[PDB]
Amino acid sequence: RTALSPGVLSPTRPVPNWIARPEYVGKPAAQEGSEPWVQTPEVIEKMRVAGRIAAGALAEAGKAVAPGVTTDELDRIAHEYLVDNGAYPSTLGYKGFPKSCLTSLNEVICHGIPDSTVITDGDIVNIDVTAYIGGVHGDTNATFPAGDVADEHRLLVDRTREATMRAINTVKPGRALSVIGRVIESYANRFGYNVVRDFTGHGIGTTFHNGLVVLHYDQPAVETIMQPGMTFTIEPMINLGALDYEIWDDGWTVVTKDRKWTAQFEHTLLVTDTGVEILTAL
Ligand code: MET
Ligand SMILES: [Co+2]
Ligand SMILES: [Co+2]
Ligand code: NA
């Protein structure tokens, strides 16, 4: 199974005019980075809707993961599930991103662009979908095996899922935000994996990446305390090999230098009055 290279991008997928675009569509940058970290009750409930739709789109595209299928096809499926449910794919036209979801195979850490790339027996495929509806976003991702995946890789996927859900289970008001990345990095290190540091979770609400940063490694210098109504992602990328990476000429696709495989899972979370709610639960 050879190292991946860029395929052919299909043309921009249409979304019907009635679906509200986020403000940043067709602009070089987004108006984000200074929004409140705690959301209003109205926004939280809207985020439940956006989260459920993103989770649906993810599940639908994940069902299509099989050898012989293209990453473009995964994007077609996600895109149509979002549009059918009245949501705008938040990635489409976000800082020039050309598609409706991110498809990241094997050695691709993240941010792969759906294209003519064909999935083969034994690949692992991350699909990352974000929905924008009711003026809010919901952001979720998962890595799916394609055909007969090597034990080494099934384990990596299963343990990255598990790291993610363990971190989620620590979310509670009054707990330090830094606990998330301590729980993830401990679990990863237990099996000799390395957590990606340069890519992080993020606050999300009426804007996609609102300025709050959630680290996935141990960094106890962060002083942020979780507060009821805060909304953010937990989305650790976990590597078999070393952390070093390259970014393709496309400006998006991040690949391991050593070409060893890497997995990711993501949910959007709400800090409740006493614990956590997974907004992107199926
Ligand atoms: C296109 S920027 C990356 C978007 C991705 N859905 C994330 O989880 O932030
Ligand atoms: Co995402
Ligand atoms: Co995210
Ligand atoms: Na990967």
Side-chain angles (χ1 to χ4, degrees), residues 54-88:
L58 177 55
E60 270 274 272
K63 284 154 148 181
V65 168
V69 182
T70 62
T71 56
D72 192 64
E73 176 76 348
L74 299 181
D75 177 85
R76 198 208 109 249
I77 292 171
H79 179 106
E80 299 190 0
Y81 185 98
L82 297 162
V83 165
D84 253 76
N85 283 275
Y88 185 86

Coordinates of all heavy atoms in Angstrom, one line a residue, residues 54-88:
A54 N -24.8 17.1 12.0 CA -23.5 16.7 11.6 C -23.2 15.3 11.9 O -22.5 14.6 11.1 CB -22.4 17.7 12.3
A55 N -23.7 14.8 13.0 CA -23.5 13.3 13.4 C -24.2 12.4 12.4 O -23.6 11.4 12.0 CB -24.0 13.1 14.8
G56 N -25.4 12.9 12.0 CA -26.0 12.1 10.9 C -25.2 12.0 9.6 O -25.2 10.9 8.9
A57 N -24.7 13.1 9.1 CA -23.9 13.2 7.9 C -22.7 12.3 8.1 O -22.3 11.5 7.2 CB -23.5 14.7 7.6
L58 N -22.1 12.4 9.2 CA -20.9 11.6 9.4 C -21.2 10.1 9.3 O -20.5 9.3 8.7 CB -20.3 11.9 10.8 CG -19.1 11.0 11.3 CD1 -17.9 11.1 10.2 CD2 -18.6 11.4 12.7
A59 N -22.3 9.7 10.0 CA -22.7 8.3 10.0 C -23.0 7.8 8.6 O -22.7 6.7 8.2 CB -23.9 8.1 10.9
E60 N -23.7 8.7 7.8 CA -24.1 8.3 6.5 C -22.8 8.2 5.6 O -22.7 7.2 4.8 CB -25.1 9.3 5.9 CG -26.6 8.8 6.1 CD -27.1 7.8 5.2 OE1 -27.7 8.2 4.1 OE2 -27.0 6.6 5.4
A61 N -21.9 9.1 5.7 CA -20.7 9.0 4.9 C -19.9 7.8 5.4 O -19.3 7.0 4.5 CB -19.9 10.3 4.9
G62 N -19.8 7.5 6.7 CA -19.1 6.4 7.2 C -19.5 5.0 6.7 O -18.7 4.1 6.5
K63 N -20.9 4.9 6.5 CA -21.4 3.7 5.9 C -20.9 3.4 4.6 O -20.9 2.2 4.2 CB -22.9 3.8 5.8 CG -23.6 3.5 7.1 CD -24.9 4.2 7.2 CE -26.0 3.5 8.0 NZ -27.3 4.2 8.0
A64 N -20.5 4.4 3.8 CA -20.0 4.3 2.4 C -18.6 3.9 2.4 O -18.0 3.6 1.3 CB -20.3 5.5 1.6
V65 N -17.9 3.9 3.5 CA -16.4 3.6 3.5 C -16.2 2.1 3.1 O -16.7 1.3 3.8 CB -15.8 4.0 4.8 CG1 -14.3 3.4 4.8 CG2 -15.7 5.5 5.0
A66 N -15.6 1.9 2.0 CA -15.4 0.5 1.6 C -14.4 0.5 0.5 O -14.2 1.6 -0.1 CB -16.7 -0.1 1.0
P67 N -13.6 -0.6 0.3 CA -12.7 -0.5 -0.8 C -13.4 -0.3 -2.2 O -14.4 -0.8 -2.4 CB -12.0 -1.9 -0.8 CG -12.1 -2.2 0.7 CD -13.5 -1.8 1.1
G68 N -12.7 0.5 -2.9 CA -13.3 0.9 -4.3 C -13.9 2.3 -4.3 O -14.1 2.8 -5.4
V69 N -14.2 2.9 -3.1 CA -15.0 4.1 -3.1 C -14.1 5.3 -3.1 O -12.9 5.2 -2.6 CB -15.9 4.1 -1.8 CG1 -16.8 5.3 -1.7 CG2 -16.7 2.8 -1.9
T70 N -14.5 6.4 -3.6 CA -13.5 7.6 -3.6 C -13.8 8.5 -2.4 O -14.9 8.5 -1.9 CB -13.5 8.4 -4.9 OG1 -14.8 9.0 -5.1 CG2 -13.3 7.6 -6.1
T71 N -12.8 9.3 -2.1 CA -13.0 10.3 -1.0 C -14.0 11.3 -1.5 O -14.9 11.8 -0.8 CB -11.8 10.9 -0.5 OG1 -10.9 11.5 -1.5 CG2 -10.9 9.8 0.4
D72 N -13.9 11.7 -2.8 CA -15.0 12.5 -3.4 C -16.4 12.1 -3.2 O -17.3 12.9 -2.9 CB -14.8 12.7 -4.9 CG -15.7 13.8 -5.4 OD1 -15.5 15.0 -5.0 OD2 -16.5 13.5 -6.3
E73 N -16.6 10.8 -3.3 CA -17.9 10.2 -3.0 C -18.3 10.3 -1.6 O -19.5 10.4 -1.3 CB -17.9 8.7 -3.6 CG -19.2 8.0 -3.3 CD -20.4 8.4 -4.2 OE1 -20.4 9.4 -4.9 OE2 -21.4 7.6 -4.2
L74 N -17.4 10.2 -0.7 CA -17.8 10.3 0.7 C -18.3 11.8 0.9 O -19.3 11.9 1.6 CB -16.6 10.1 1.6 CG -16.0 8.6 1.5 CD1 -14.9 8.5 2.5 CD2 -17.1 7.6 1.7
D75 N -17.7 12.7 0.3 CA -18.1 14.2 0.3 C -19.4 14.4 -0.3 O -20.2 15.1 0.3 CB -17.0 15.0 -0.3 CG -17.3 16.4 -0.3 OD1 -17.1 17.1 0.7 OD2 -17.7 16.9 -1.4
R76 N -19.7 13.7 -1.4 CA -21.0 13.8 -2.0 C -22.1 13.4 -1.1 O -23.1 14.0 -0.9 CB -21.1 12.9 -3.3 CG -22.2 13.3 -4.3 CD -22.6 12.0 -5.1 NE -23.9 11.5 -4.6 CZ -24.2 10.4 -3.9 NH1 -23.3 9.5 -3.6 NH2 -25.4 10.2 -3.6
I77 N -21.9 12.3 -0.4 CA -22.8 11.8 0.5 C -23.0 12.7 1.7 O -24.1 12.9 2.2 CB -22.4 10.4 1.0 CG1 -22.5 9.4 -0.2 CG2 -23.4 9.9 2.1 CD1 -21.9 8.0 0.1
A78 N -21.9 13.2 2.3 CA -22.0 14.1 3.5 C -22.8 15.3 3.1 O -23.7 15.8 3.9 CB -20.7 14.4 4.1
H79 N -22.3 15.9 2.0 CA -22.9 17.1 1.4 C -24.4 17.0 1.2 O -25.1 17.9 1.6 CB -22.1 17.6 0.2 CG -22.6 18.8 -0.5 ND1 -22.0 20.0 -0.4 CD2 -23.7 19.0 -1.3 CE1 -22.6 20.9 -1.1 NE2 -23.7 20.3 -1.7
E80 N -24.8 16.0 0.6 CA -26.3 15.8 0.4 C -27.1 15.5 1.6 O -28.2 16.0 1.7 CB -26.5 14.7 -0.7 CG -25.9 15.0 -2.1 CD -26.3 14.1 -3.2 OE1 -27.0 13.2 -3.0 OE2 -25.8 14.4 -4.4
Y81 N -26.5 14.9 2.6 CA -27.2 14.6 3.9 C -27.3 16.1 4.5 O -28.4 16.4 5.0 CB -26.5 13.7 4.9 CG -27.3 13.4 6.1 CD1 -28.0 12.2 6.3 CD2 -27.3 14.3 7.2 CE1 -28.7 12.0 7.4 CE2 -28.0 14.0 8.4 CZ -28.7 12.9 8.5 OH -29.4 12.6 9.6
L82 N -26.3 16.9 4.5 CA -26.4 18.2 5.2 C -27.5 19.1 4.5 O -28.4 19.6 5.1 CB -25.1 19.0 5.2 CG -23.9 18.3 6.0 CD1 -22.6 18.9 5.6 CD2 -24.2 18.4 7.5
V83 N -27.4 19.2 3.2 CA -28.3 20.0 2.3 C -29.8 19.5 2.5 O -30.7 20.3 2.7 CB -27.8 20.1 0.9 CG1 -28.9 20.6 -0.1 CG2 -26.7 21.0 0.9
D84 N -30.0 18.2 2.5 CA -31.3 17.6 2.8 C -31.9 18.0 4.1 O -33.1 17.9 4.3 CB -31.3 16.1 2.8 CG -31.9 15.4 1.7 OD1 -31.2 15.5 0.6 OD2 -33.0 15.0 1.8
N85 N -31.0 18.2 5.1 CA -31.5 18.6 6.4 C -31.4 20.1 6.6 O -31.6 20.5 7.8 CB -30.7 17.8 7.4 CG -31.2 16.4 7.5 OD1 -32.1 16.1 8.2 ND2 -30.5 15.5 6.8
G86 N -31.2 20.9 5.6 CA -31.2 22.4 5.7 C -30.0 23.0 6.3 O -30.0 24.1 6.7
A87 N -28.9 22.2 6.3 CA -27.6 22.7 6.9 C -26.7 23.1 5.8 O -26.6 22.3 4.8 CB -27.0 21.7 7.8
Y88 N -25.8 24.0 6.1 CA -24.7 24.4 5.2 C -23.5 23.6 5.7 O -23.3 23.6 6.8 CB -24.4 25.9 5.3 CG -23.4 26.3 4.2 CD1 -23.7 26.7 2.9 CD2 -22.0 26.3 4.5 CE1 -22.7 27.1 2.0 CE2 -21.0 26.6 3.6 CZ -21.4 27.0 2.3 OH -20.5 27.4 1.4

